[PDB]
A paper describes a structure:
Each time the ribosome moves along the messenger RNA ([name]) by one codon, the transfer RNAs ([name]) are displaced from the A (aminoacyl) to P (peptidyl) and from the P to E (exit) sites. The reaction is facilitated by elongation factor G (EF-G), a translational [name]. Time-resolved kinetic studies suggested that EF-G hydrolyses guanosine triphosphate (GTP) rapidly after binding to the ribosome, but the release of the reaction product inorganic phosphate (Pi) is delayed and coupled to rapid [name]–[name] movement. We visualized the early steps of translocation by time-resolved cryo-EM using native [name] pretranslocation complexes (PRE) and EF-G–GTP, but slowed down translocation by lowering the reaction temperature, by adding polyamines and the antibiotic apramycin (Apr).
A smaller fraction of PRE complexes without EF-G is in a rotated state with [name] in hybrid (H) states, denoted H1 or H2 depending on the orientation of the A-site [name] elbow region relative to the LSU. The ratio of H1 to H2 on rotated ribosomes is independent of EF-G, indicating that factor binding or GTP hydrolysis do not affect the [name] dynamics on the LSU. However, these thermal motions alone, in the absence of EF-G, are not sufficient to promote the displacement of [name] together with the [name] on the SSU. [name] movement on the SSU is the rate-limiting step of translocation in the absence of EF-G11 and is slow in the absence of GTP hydrolysis.
Numbering used by the authors:
A (entry chain 2): 1 to 46
B (entry chain C): 1 to 271
C (entry chain T): 1 to 93
The structure:
RNA sequence: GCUCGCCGGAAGACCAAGGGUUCCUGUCCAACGUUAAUCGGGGCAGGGUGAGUCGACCCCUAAGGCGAGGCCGAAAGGCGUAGUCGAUGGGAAACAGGUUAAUAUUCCUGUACUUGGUGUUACUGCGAAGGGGGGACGGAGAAGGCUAUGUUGGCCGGGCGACGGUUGUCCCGGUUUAAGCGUGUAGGCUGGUUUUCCAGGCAAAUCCGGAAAAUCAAGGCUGAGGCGUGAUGACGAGGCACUACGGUGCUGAAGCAACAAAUGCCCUGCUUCCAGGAAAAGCCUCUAAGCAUCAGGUAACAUCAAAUCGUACCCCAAACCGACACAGGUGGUCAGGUAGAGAAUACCAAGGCGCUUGAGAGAACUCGGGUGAAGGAACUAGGCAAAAUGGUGCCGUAACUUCGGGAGAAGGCACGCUGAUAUGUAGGUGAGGUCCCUCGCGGAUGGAGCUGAAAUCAGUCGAAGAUACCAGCUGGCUGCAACUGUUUAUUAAAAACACAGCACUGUGCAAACACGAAAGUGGACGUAUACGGUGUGACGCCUGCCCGGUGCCGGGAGGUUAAU
RNA sequence: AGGACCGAACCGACUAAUGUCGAAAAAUUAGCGGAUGACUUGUGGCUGGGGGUGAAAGGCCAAUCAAACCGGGAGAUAGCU
């Protein structure tokens, strides 16, 4: 019963991290759609 | 060389080894080695372009001297070796000056022979020189297609190309496929067949031997579903189609060649 | 050379505790509280300048912040850096 | 606290990942805890994570990512050169003891070691993005040497036993010591040294590669381990003091041999096999531009520095992934005794637990088991499930066979303990002393001691000696698939898929083909003994007729026919 | 030597019972197959939606797959309830 979420902070940050978002045009627009909604935690960094 | 293996195990029952006992047992010559990472068939875009590739043993790359661009300098063979990147073997040769280079191993090239390239080469096998100094009718291998290009024809195990004619600046060559083809008289070529002519006689016995040469299984489009292959579907071994590749194009006889740039050199196409 | 304007900023407070008094008695170490930045060189010079003692070696460690809730809202105390400053022989005050 | 019981290749111990204070102390019992709770991984407060050497960081790179310029693309952007990042790999150095309520290779005691700086002194050619070396590499097998460790004996301390006996071949406990430093072993590999030259190592090289000549035959490298020092130190069963009755205080004897021994280490070795088994820095060396008296390099001293981050705790789980204090999942490391081939299994050690509702009762019925008269598949869709067989040695073993198999076919017999052969043998180990020498960690000896199976004979006990756990049911005919394998995560594991093998077919390399508006990439750093597609599916014997339809290959007499 | 044999770790999942508001949104118990290899596993990476990958089952692509999930077109449309 290997559940789907097997955590790893390295994989987490390289996939959904801030720098991961900011690398690409489409990700720089996820941070825009989150600053829009006014999210406290923009990305996964903690 | 060609030895049938005793059936002490199913999967050993049909193996036919090719045990050439003069290959240098041990490690290759380091300065002529380099990384060679398996691709998996995958390409630039990371998608499989060539199917049924991936796996098998890790194998280094042996920088083979194909140009053979050392003239006047005689070279002595010193080691016949096993190259996993070819079907032929290779032959570490040592020049008078002190350079070592792997070359394809011809049929009679044994450790101790002497060879040299350039127009002043003798026509004993293992020598390379332009197919303007080589006599018509001779058997040659490691043929170039453009002068200095490097050597692209007759490189497999036991494959050779014979200079059939010579119409001034060009040279007709009966390629191992049966097709004749003009090749500029300056295109260098090395004499005699290539070694390891028994290569074709191994039988591999089992599926794992296909595997560890980097060959993944090949599904028959008949077994697939209508979505995967043009063949496919049908409530139990139904075909009704003309045999086509997985991409619709017809196979079982359909000329896919279209070059129009090099067909001026193809004197007589293969048979 | 460390500027005294920084040396007067480094040290925060003496850390008083059972283990701190224990280290003082049986090992002549003054447990301290220093700023988070606080290189060991920073701390050693600050001690030798502001207490005028002779330090043999410093051994820092960063203490994390307890997640201390206050009522319903969740809280988080701050990280701080401890400094086990071992004096040679001289004295503490 | 005593007794009982459970795990003990784990249900113990240490980690990584992940978590994030759950760690320790005091304190409280509302809520949380499937019950009560004084207790807690709960609430509140305080404390606790100490590094030149252990990880990270850092240096170097793999796959891969990004990518100045560049090429391509309606725009976004795609690809990619230099370059730059990217461990899961490569790169310097610390161990033992003690100590905390909670940290320890971090603190303290002792004993080290590494890399840089900076002077000093003395010798001095130094100088890199560049050359060369090394780093640096597989699978399997076979041993031999040793160690971890264990067992026994000795030695030391203690006891002489609640019930027959227990001054003895008696019982109990201990019998530990590291890094480092110095030897340089069992071993493994290499032939050394010198002079001369050389179209090769993108220049240069005094280095590597090469050709010789001389000259010697040994030199060199690697290396477990052991041995000495480290260490007359620590540790040490216990004893004597006092009590928070929880440990601090002091002292502390012996501290050895033999045998067995690893899956650990020599071994990145050796032997072999084909499938032919990273890179790059660190390190060594060579010169270039440059200085060349300098600078810089070397060695001895002296001192300096070694930053920052992590360090508590769980980690096969109540702390991580599963909504839960969830019978699930989770990579690595260490692995004691007896019996055992064994990391199985049984019982135990160190250690840790009794799984967070109990108390009774002793209905039906359900679940997990034990036993069963006579019969023995009559059950049933079906011997489903149970039952049964189950080990080692020797004898023996059918059709068929592709000569390997089938086969552990089938079947039969023996098995405990005691004694003798032989107060323990064959074997293994191997002491002293005796020599011999290039004297060593040497060699021949030489057999004390230890260890020690197996067998034969005789006796003896039981219903039963493979006595428990553990541990094949067997045989006949037949369909299909050659076989091993893969398969529908979560109702289908098959005859399906794959396969080796066979054939047809395309493809001459700017290969076909595929991904791509393109560039480009794979194919392949391959070259027709290669590569793709399709079908069939080992092997043996073979694979017959039909070219009308459809497709493909070619042909050109004519008909028809687009843009123009 | 072996895609050899028996058999633990390890991987898998053939049968049966249980469980079926479960201890568990696929497990437990007892047996079962492979167990030096077409093996298994840790870390990191690459491939993406008419697309990927597929020893091929329409299998898998985050408990979702004959076309994922999220947001939008969007208050789709619904002679139907």
């Amino acid at each position: 019963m290997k559940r789907t979420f097997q955590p790893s902070v390295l994989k987490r940050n390289r996939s959904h991290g801030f720098r991961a978002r900011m690398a690409t045009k489409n990700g720089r627009q996820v941070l825009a759609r989150r600053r829009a909604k006014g999210r406290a935690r923009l990305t996964v960094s903690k | 060389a060609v030895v049938k293996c005793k059936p002490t195990s199913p999967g050993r029952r049909h193996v036919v080894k090719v045990v050439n006992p003069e290959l240098h047992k041990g490690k290759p010559f380091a300065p002529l080695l380099e990384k060679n990472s398996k691709s998996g068939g995958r390409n630039n875009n990371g998608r499989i372009t060539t199917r049924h590739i991936g796996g098998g043993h890790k194998q280094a790359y042996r920088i083979v001297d194909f140009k053979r661009n050392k003239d006047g300098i005689p070279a002595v063979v010193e080691r016949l070796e096993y190259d996993p990147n070819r079907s032929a073997n290779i032959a570490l040769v040592l020049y008078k000056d002190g350079e070592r280079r792997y070359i394809l191993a011809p049929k009679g090239l044994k450790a101790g022979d002497q060879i040299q390239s350039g127009v002043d080469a003798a026509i004993k096998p293992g020598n390379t020189l332009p197919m303007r100094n080589i006599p018509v009718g001779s058997t040659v291998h490691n043929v170039e297609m453009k002068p200095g290009k490097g050597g692209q024809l007759a490189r497999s195990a036991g494959t050779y190309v014979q200079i059939v004619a010579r119409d001034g600046a060009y040279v007709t060559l009966r390629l191992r496929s049966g097709e004749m083809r003009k090749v500029e008289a300056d295109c260098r070529a090395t004499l005699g067949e290539v070694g390891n002519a028994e290569h074709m006689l191994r039988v591999l016995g089992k599926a794992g031997a296909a595997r560890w040469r980097g060959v993944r299984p090949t599904v028959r489009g008949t077994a697939m579903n209508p979505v995967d292959h043009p063949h496919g579907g049908g409530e139990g071994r139904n075909f009704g189609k003309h045999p086509v590749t997985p991409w619709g194009v017809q196979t079982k006889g359909k000329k896919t060649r279209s070059n129009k740039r090099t067909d001026k050199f193809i004197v007589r196409r293969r048979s | 050379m460390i500027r005294e304007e920084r040396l007067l900023k480094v040290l925060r407070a003496p850390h008083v505790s059972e283990k701190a008094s224990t280290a003082m008695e049986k090992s002549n170490t003054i447990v301290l509280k220093v700023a988070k930045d606080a290189t060991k060189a920073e701390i050693k010079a600050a001690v030798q300048k502001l207490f005028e003692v002779e330090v043999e070696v410093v051994n820092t460690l960063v203490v994390k912040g307890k997640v201390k809730r206050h009522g319903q809202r969740i809280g988080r105390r701050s990280d701080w850096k401890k400094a086990y400053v071992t004096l040679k022989e001289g004295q503490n005050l």
